[PDB]
Amino acid sequence: MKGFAMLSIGKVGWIEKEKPAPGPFDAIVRPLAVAPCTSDIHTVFEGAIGERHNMILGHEAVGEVVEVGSEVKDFKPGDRVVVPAITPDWRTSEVQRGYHQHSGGMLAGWKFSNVKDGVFGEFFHVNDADMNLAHLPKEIPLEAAVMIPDMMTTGFHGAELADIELGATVAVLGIGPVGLMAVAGAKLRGAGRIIAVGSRPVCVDAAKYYGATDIVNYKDGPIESQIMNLTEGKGVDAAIIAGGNADIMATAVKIVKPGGTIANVNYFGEGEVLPVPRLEWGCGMAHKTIKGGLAPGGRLRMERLIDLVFYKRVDPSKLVTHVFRGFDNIEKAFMLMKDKPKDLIKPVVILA
Amino acid sequence: MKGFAMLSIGKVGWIEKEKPAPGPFDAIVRPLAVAPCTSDIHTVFEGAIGERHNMILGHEAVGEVVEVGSEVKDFKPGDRVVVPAITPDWRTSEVQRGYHQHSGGMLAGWKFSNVKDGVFGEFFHVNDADMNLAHLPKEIPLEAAVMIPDMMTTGFHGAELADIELGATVAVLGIGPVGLMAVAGAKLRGAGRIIAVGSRPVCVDAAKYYGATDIVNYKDGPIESQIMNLTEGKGVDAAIIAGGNADIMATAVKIVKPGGTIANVNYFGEGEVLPVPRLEWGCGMAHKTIKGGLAPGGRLRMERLIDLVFYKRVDPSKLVTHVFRGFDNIEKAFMLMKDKPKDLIKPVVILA
Amino acid sequence: MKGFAMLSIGKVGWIEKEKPAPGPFDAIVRPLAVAPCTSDIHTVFEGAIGERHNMILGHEAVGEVVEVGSEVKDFKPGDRVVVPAITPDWRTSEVQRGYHQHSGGMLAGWKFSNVKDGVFGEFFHVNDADMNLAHLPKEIPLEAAVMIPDMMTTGFHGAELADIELGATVAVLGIGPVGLMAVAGAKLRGAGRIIAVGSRPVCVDAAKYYGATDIVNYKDGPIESQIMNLTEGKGVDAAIIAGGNADIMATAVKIVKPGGTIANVNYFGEGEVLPVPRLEWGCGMAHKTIKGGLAPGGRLRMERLIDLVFYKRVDPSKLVTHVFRGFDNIEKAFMLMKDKPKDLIKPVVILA
Amino acid sequence: MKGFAMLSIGKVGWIEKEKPAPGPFDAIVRPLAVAPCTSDIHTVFEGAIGERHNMILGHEAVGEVVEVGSEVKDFKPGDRVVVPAITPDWRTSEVQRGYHQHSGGMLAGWKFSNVKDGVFGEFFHVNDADMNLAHLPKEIPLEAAVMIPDMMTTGFHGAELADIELGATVAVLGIGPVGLMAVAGAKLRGAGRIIAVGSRPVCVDAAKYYGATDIVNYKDGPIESQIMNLTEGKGVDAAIIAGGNADIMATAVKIVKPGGTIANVNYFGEGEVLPVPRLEWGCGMAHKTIKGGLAPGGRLRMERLIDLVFYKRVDPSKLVTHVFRGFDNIEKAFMLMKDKPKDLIKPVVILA
Ligand SMILES: NC(=O)c1ccc[n+]([C@@H]2O[C@H](COP(=O)([O-])OP(=O)(O)OC[C@H]3O[C@@H](n4cnc5c(N)ncnc54)[C@H](OP(=O)(O)O)[C@@H]3O)[C@@H](O)[C@H]2O)c1
Ligand SMILES: NC(=O)c1ccc[n+]([C@@H]2O[C@H](COP(=O)([O-])OP(=O)(O)OC[C@H]3O[C@@H](n4cnc5c(N)ncnc54)[C@H](OP(=O)(O)O)[C@@H]3O)[C@@H](O)[C@H]2O)c1
Ligand SMILES: NC(=O)c1ccc[n+]([C@@H]2O[C@H](COP(=O)([O-])OP(=O)(O)OC[C@H]3O[C@@H](n4cnc5c(N)ncnc54)[C@H](OP(=O)(O)O)[C@@H]3O)[C@@H](O)[C@H]2O)c1
Numbered sequence A, B, C, D: 001m002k003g004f005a006m007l008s009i010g011k012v013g014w015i016e017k018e019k020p021a022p023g024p025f026d027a028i029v030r031p032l033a034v035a036p037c038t039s040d041i042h043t044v045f046e047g048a049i050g051e052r053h054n055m056i057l058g059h060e061a062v063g064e065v066v067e068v069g070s071e072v073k074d075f076k077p078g079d080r081v082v083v084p085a086i087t088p089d090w091r092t093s094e095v096q097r098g099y100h101q102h103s104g105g106m107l108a109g110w111k112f113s114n115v116k117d118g119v120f121g122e123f124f125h126v127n128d129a130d131m132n133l134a135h136l137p138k139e140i141p142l143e144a145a146v147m148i149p150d151m152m153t154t155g156f157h158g159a160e161l162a163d164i165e166l167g168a169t170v171a172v173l174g175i176g177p178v179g180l181m182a183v184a185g186a187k188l189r190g191a192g193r194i195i196a197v198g199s200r201p202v203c204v205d206a207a208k209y210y211g212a213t214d215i216v217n218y219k220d221g222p223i224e225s226q227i228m229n230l231t232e233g234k235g236v237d238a239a240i241i242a243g244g245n246a247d248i249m250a251t252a253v254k255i256v257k258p259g260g261t262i263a264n265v266n267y268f269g270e271g272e273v274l275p276v277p278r279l280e281w282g283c284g285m286a287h288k289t290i291k292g293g294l295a296p297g298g299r300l301r302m303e304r305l306i307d308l309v310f311y312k313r314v315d316p317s318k319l320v321t322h323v324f325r326g327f328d329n330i331e332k333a334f335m336l337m338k339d340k341p342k343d344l345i346k347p348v349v350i351l352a
């Protein structure tokens, strides 16, 4: 009944809450491994989605089922499961339109640490267990598995939105844990040249590991003119935004060729307007499609990504640089996300 | 020959130029019916695509072939043809990528009054007659046929970009001649409710004629607040932008539901940045796809829209509010586009 | 209660069954109007999908909600509803893949008169009311509304699967009620020339009403020869199959041009294989895509087709050639579908 | 000029022909490396596309440009180039419709050893050199590069047509060179499990090399049965057909789940019809899309596959099991393609 929660905007700390009870279709899960996200920094310290009061944080968890509702059919207590960060209500009009990420409202499929208590507690509540849980194979280590709920689905969704054709040249703007899975996702969509944009040397090494053929550091100059030289004025076929300020939107439109695609998965927390360059967008007519999506969730998304991990299509363990232990280290791993060490990509806290 | 040209930014007038000469694959066409476009106002008086010097204007024309190159197979002198605004070079890498509008560079398939002398002349040059001309059936009048090169393909391209599903609710921002064709295109994509946004009474009558079920005038208040009341907070499935300043882009994102599409065909002439509202775009994750395209051209595009007029799927003659006559009246119709009268939609100058 | 049921393969009759009770998410409906389907002839007399025992027939119904479950939120007793022919279980993996029509197994989204008691009873059961019912606007009469559950969604799905481009030439093979809605559907996707294939004058008249520009009589001569002559050897951009024997598949492949689409919504009830002509399929390489699909259902599909009726995009009332009053005439209307007289398109029974 | 030609159906031999001259847009190329194809066996010995007289065989070649026309702007004599098997005329309506493979008619984008003298001569003619040749980087050896013109673009086209989603389970029916590249192609689309169906031990090794996770031998029982056991009766998300008689079409339909795709790239050379099984295709309604395509060609396609080789995304040299050198050994390699020894995958003849 203890959990690390967001007291208000700019203030965090442990609180005490009632242990959640499952509905007939729900499950209660105790976490075996969790991970903090930059998104919890964007909501706490930037108030990007408004004010909260005593909301448990955290949304990336592999856990063990301890209680199921009278209608749960595919999960028993004791089952080890990968919980997706997006756990929608599956009976809404948006699902019938094909957008479960927005089931019941904009971004409403994202429930943990948004409009529902997160996984940073001795237990948490997963709604619609048969639809929003996936069994964890015994062959996948806990550290790699906890990268599936959020980092892998978001990074891969960026590659999916980019509509990569075989052999296409892809740029990945941002090589944090999300952008690194975007680099992997691009390679899984059969990209040829993958140009990664970042600075931290631990991120640059992992980007090459996941298939980046070129590294672009802003120290050499503006990223726009730097990538344009790599492409001899042609540009990239797609640019995946996985970090940066609102101005990175303008950088993306400038480096993508006409007919190319700008695929955003970045959570912009500050700024009122995301700039789109009029001239580099063809004054409205360059066919530079812009996409920006919340990562898919639910049981099928996790099962699909479990197979990709299982059959060795992507190894997410290289995202995990720091492994803590014990509930108390949740606060420390969370604070590592506010001020990132230079040797950090993604921390993981193991609990049992 | 003589032709109405853009002397410099902000100055137009008639000039003297040699009659153009065709290559083995090209044709020389004399115009039978022409029409001016708002796009030529954006370039002349706003300098939206840079400076020009003595460039004949005009890109909407129905003509008669007067000379063909030794390699033209399908067109003879004396053929009456619909000339598209977009006449790309068809042997480029962009065409192999599937974006003929950008063959040779951004917007480079748009040649007339962009990088080439336009149709406001005694003759004009059409590159690759076999690929960029369509035969005009005797059953379609000159006034209806001259709407096909630019207005119809652009409006229909807005509806194509919008990814309309059967029964979807569509908003069209701007009900000038392009937006009027976007209301028609929306209906031809099977839209249910079509909410048109405009004020001019002549345009509103035409909007209803082409399918609009609701008329939104800014007089009642903000367009965003007005459309949200019409849809009980849900919004529209797609929004076609066919006019307005750079702020209309923000309006379209605010009124489109998550997972919807913003389809822009407006030529933005002023401002550096098209604003995209961070919050109403889901902070980057609302799956509100943004598109913006130059209208398709070439022979096949024209033949397909010719069939749409022939089989009575759309009557573009209702766009034509003014019918001038004589080469001299081209200057009259062009300035008539800088300050649109309240009873104007689209003017047409008949020549022979 | 009373109900018109499939006793066994080849025999139908009135039986006695228990009035269904709703689960927490379900509703009980009494029908106000019903219609019989050719699909129930395939099931009973051809045994097309196997034996059945005491299954009430029928899957096209508009009704009145009489009872709802404790969890039903959007529908109360007294509400007049349009009931889709397809009412899937929405919490399955197939829904997460995007194929609700096969929720639980192939064709399993189709419940009425497949794996569940149909609507030809004093009451029927609708699983998951909030997801599988739509409100009926008072402006839409009963006869028209009952064309929405199955005829309109199936025929429109043919047009959806055909991937119709603006101005394309489309052929519709079979112009019973489903094919007539495929003609209308092709019009709602922007088809130019629509070539309808059939012989019965009542259907030919309706096909012209719904937009057919050409009528091909299959008893007049070979369909393939006739359509090639009409298209000057080019073929059509798409052929929608809405009737005929297995060899209509070969006819469709033979008339579609390379890169075109064959879109089947016909329920084939006899024969081991459907033939694809090797040579006219380009020996496997002609890019003639073949689709075949169960019509969409659920609340959203009904609501979108209701808007197409409400805003007068389609008037399905011309499909109704026979209207009867009274429960016992369910038998008469059903045998009408078996006998298929020359003046029949679709019969409706009013129980109001 | 000497050349290995198809004299008539069932007979091949060396003939003498005049050395071709190029049009103003064309190039004459001398082969540095060539490879024979199973498709030529279908053509010569089954007559799958009719009778030919003294047609030089072969459509797989890397060569040196020896002469160009006056309008060729990107290639000079001495340039080493990858020549695609498909070299269409790019100025046709089919290119405008988006299908260069059928430019001028069904399969007409495939010219070499179809409607044009092939690459098995001292020189050959490439039409439209600027559009249909790709520069060959010095880093790619000749034997691997000659897998790009046909094997790689066909197998990858199968993965493209299969509409593969991340993590999906894919079956590849047939693992000769085309099927092995479909295995690599499926991996480049992000497939999870990949079930290869073959029996020759050398092909099984290569299939495991390119990413197969499961091997089904059509000797341990029916393919359909075994694959259903591997998938627990669920089936595969897509099946790529790359070999087999006409019955393989029925096999593919029986193993694909509802909503999945059957993607054929096999050249069927015998049989009047390809059987589609009525029940397992849902009596017409299972949403099992069937595609079948001639492989893409042209400059842009070769360039993108060159990049996938250059950046080490795929290594096609494992396809090459026999390398000879000498013009005369074209006959030797071709006959190996007829009577396929169990250690053969693809032979290559080196000429310089
Ligand atoms: N849509 C979803 O479902 C979803 C899910 C999770 C997270 N997100 C959001 O997506 C973003 C990425 O997640 P994350 O955990 O990987 O954050 P992160 O660790 O902070 O990575 C941000 C990256 O952006 C780089 N960067 C900073 N300024 C840049 C600039 N001008 N140009 C290019 N790159 C620049 C940084 O490079 P260096 O640090 O090396 O200098 C860094 O690598 C976050 O904002 C997150 O909130 C979205
Ligand atoms: N992509 C292409 O291929 C292509 C082709 C041709 C043209 N275009 C461009 O697309 C645009 C449409 O062409 P057009 O000839 O129809 O121009 P137009 O006659 O000036 O029509 C512009 C429409 O926008 C309305 N409008 C003005 N302010 C607005 C606001 N805040 N919000 C919403 N609507 C507002 C106007 O309403 P009222 O006038 O009734 O007050 C008018 O109906 C032009 O800019 C044109 O240059 C693009
Ligand atoms: N996928 C779904 O969800 C769904 C839904 C409902 C129904 N269906 C099925 O789709 C089909 C259409 O239903 P329906 O009520 O419209 O049946 P219908 O009235 O019997 O329509 C049959 C049409 O096919 C014509 N026909 C027969 N042989 C032909 C041939 N060799 N060539 C060309 N046309 C031929 C018939 O000609 P005539 O004009 O002379 O009769 C008629 O026009 C049925 O089989 C039905 O079971 C599928």
Ligand SMILES: NC(=O)c1ccc[n+]([C@@H]2O[C@H](COP(=O)([O-])OP(=O)(O)OC[C@H]3O[C@@H](n4cnc5c(N)ncnc54)[C@H](OP(=O)(O)O)[C@@H]3O)[C@@H](O)[C@H]2O)c1
Pocket: C285, D037, D038, D039, D040, D042, D150, D151, D154, D173, D174, D175, D176, D177, D178, D179, D197, D198, D199, D200, D203, D218, D223, D242, D243, D244, D245, D248, D264, D265, D266, D267, D268, D293, D294, D295
């Ligand atoms: N779409 C295009 O552009 C294109 C391009 C090139 C070629 N093709 C054609 O595609 C096909 C593949 O080419 P290829 O060079 O790879 O020929 P191949 O080596 O003969 O491929 C045959 C493969 O299919 C297997 N096979 C035979 N019958 C089978 C059955 N009932 N079930 C399952 N597998 C069966 C064979 O088994 P074994 O292992 O025992 O031999 C072998 O693995 C050829 O027909 C070719 O002409 C098409």
Ligand SMILES: [Zn+2]
Pocket: A037, A038, A039, A040, A059, A085, A150
């Ligand atoms: Zn996160």
Ligand SMILES: [Zn+2]
Pocket: B037, B038, B039, B040, B059, B085, B150
């Ligand atoms: Zn214009």
Ligand SMILES: [Zn+2]
Pocket: C037, C038, C039, C040, C059, C085, C150
């Ligand atoms: Zn039916």
Ligand SMILES: [Zn+2]
Pocket: D037, D038, D039, D040, D059, D085, D150
């Ligand atoms: Zn081949």
